[PDB]
Structure 1
Amino acid sequence: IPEYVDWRQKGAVTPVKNQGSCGSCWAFSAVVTIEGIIKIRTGNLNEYSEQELLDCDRRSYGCNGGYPWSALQLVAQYGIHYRNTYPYEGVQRYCRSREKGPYAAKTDGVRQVQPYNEGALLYSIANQPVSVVLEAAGKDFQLYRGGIFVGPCGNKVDHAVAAVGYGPNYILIKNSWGTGWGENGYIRIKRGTGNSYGVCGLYTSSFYPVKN
C-alpha cells in the first residue's frame, strides 16, 4: 500500500457534517464509509442518511450513542436512503425508511479490522474509508485546531469517526463536528508510536462495509 492515501482526493468523501448535540457519531462514522464504498464501486459520490441509522438501528441508542458495526449491518441487511430524502434532524425519531420509498444503496456486509494492529488498519484505509473509534472526551482533542495530534489522550474510546487517509506519521480522520473544528473538520492523528491501542485508542474497534 502507498505512502499516502487520501480518499478526499479520489472524490470519495462528502462534505464534513456537524452531528450537533446528538450522540450520533456512530451513524455519521458509518455513513462516511458507505459514501466512500459506493463511490469506489459505482463512481458516484452521494450523501446518505445518518438520520436513518439514528432512527432505525435498534441495537444502537439513538442520540445516546451506538455502534458503527450495528449501523453498518443494517445497511447491509436493508439499505440506506439519500441524505436529501432522509435529512438529518439531530434527534432520534421513528424509523421512516418505509415512508421514504426504495433504498438508495445497499451493502453486502461488514468486516472488522483486526484490533490493536496499526498495519491492518492502514491496509483497510488504503482500500476504503474505515469507521474507527477514539477517545474524544479530552480537552486536547476537543480544542484541536490542526497539526499532527499526539494527544494527550487515553484509550477510553467514546467517539466514532472515519479514517479516510493516512501518511507516514498520521491517520487522516473525518470528524463530525463541522468544518470549524480541526483542519476544516479533519484531524491527523499520529501513527507509528508502537502503542498497540493507537493514540487515543484509535485501533480499538474499526469496521468497514463490504460491497461487491
Structure 2
Amino acid sequence: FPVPPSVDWREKGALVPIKNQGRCGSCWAFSAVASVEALNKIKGGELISLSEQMMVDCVNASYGCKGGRQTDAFKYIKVHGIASSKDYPYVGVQGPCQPKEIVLKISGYRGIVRNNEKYLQIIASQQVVSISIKVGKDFQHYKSGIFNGTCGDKINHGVNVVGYGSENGIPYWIVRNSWGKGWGEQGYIRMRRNTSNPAGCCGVAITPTFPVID
C-alpha cells in the first residue's frame, strides 16, 4: 500500500480540540473516542466532539474511572452508539448511564499485527489509531521535541496516533494525549518511530486498534 512519508490528520480537520480527562482513569474512553470522531469525519461526516462521559458511565464491560478497554468502547458504540459532548459533557466522575441523542454508531473494530511499526504506519496513513503505551515519569514530564525518554514497566495509558513524520531524519509518531492543551506540544507528544525494539517507543506498536464504519 503506497505510504506517504508524513501524515497529520489535524491538518485534514479530523481532530477536535484536545481534551482533559482529569483525575479519572478514563484514558481507555478518550483513546477510543478520538479514533471514532476522526473516522466519522474522514469518511465524509461532520467533525463532532463525542462523549467520553457516556463511555465511562455506560460501558459496563469497563470500569469507569477505574480503567477500561478501548475495545469495550468500540463494541458499545457499534451496538448502542454515542452521544455528543454537547449533550453529555465530561465531568470526570462515573455516574448513571444517561440517555441522550445518538450521533452515530460504528460497524466494528480491527487490530494490527503486534509489534509492527510499519503496519501501524499503513493504518495511520488512513485514519487515527488507538494505541496503548507504558507511561512513566519521563513521559509524564515531556515538554517538547521528539521523545526518546525511558518508559514505564506496564502498559497503562491509552492514547492515539494522529500522524507521523520526521525531523532532521529522525522519524516520529504524532501522539494525541488527554491531559489538556498545557501538556507537551499543545497536548500532543512526538515519540520516536521505527525503534530497534519492534514493540516501538514505550510499546506504541504492541496493541493498536481502530474502529470501522459501514
Shorter-chain TM-score range: over 0.9
Is the 8 Å Cα contact of residues 155 and 199 (structure 1) preserved in structure 2?
no
Q: Does 1:100 find its partner at 2:100?
A: yes
**Number of matched pairs:** 208
Contact 2:28 2:157 in 1 (8 A): yes
Q: Does the aligned pair in 2 maintain the 1:81–1:104 contact within 8 Å?
A: yes
* Deviation, structure 1 residue 43: 3.9
Measure how far apart 1:192 and its partner are.
1.1
Superposition deviation, residue 155 in structure 1: 5.1
| Conservation of the 8 A alpha-carbon contact between 2:137 and 2:152 | no
3-state DSSP of counterpart to 1:119: helix
Aligned-pair Cα RMSD in Å: 1.0
- Residue 115 of structure 1 corresponds to 114
The 5 A counterparts of 1:1-212 are 1-96=3-98, 99-101=99-101, 103-136=102-135, 138-154=136-152, 156-168=154-166, 169-212=171-214
Gaps of 5+ in 1: none
Distance in 2, Cα, partners of 1:6 & 1:61: 32
Q: Is the 8 A contact 1:49 1:87 kept in 2?
A: yes
Task: Give the Cα–Cα distance (whole angstroms) in 1 for the partners of residues 196 and 46 of structure 2.
Answer: 37
With 54-63 and 8-17 compared, the bigger mean Cα shift is at: 54-63
| Cα distance in 1 between the residues matched to 2:205 and 2:21 | 23
Please give the TM-score of this superposition, normalised by the length of structure 2. 0.94
Q: Which runs of 5+ in 2 are unaligned?
A: none
Instruction: State, as a whole percentage, how many aligned pairs show the same letter.
Output: 48
Q: Does the Cα contact within 8 Å between 1:125 and 1:165 map onto a contact in 2?
A: yes
Q: Following TM superposition, where does structure 1 have runs of at least 4 consecutive aligned residues deviating by more than 6 angstroms?
A: none
Displacement of 1:157: 1.3
After superposition, the C-alpha distances for 1:69-101 in whole angstroms (9 at most, x for unaligned) are: 1111111122101110111010111111xx213
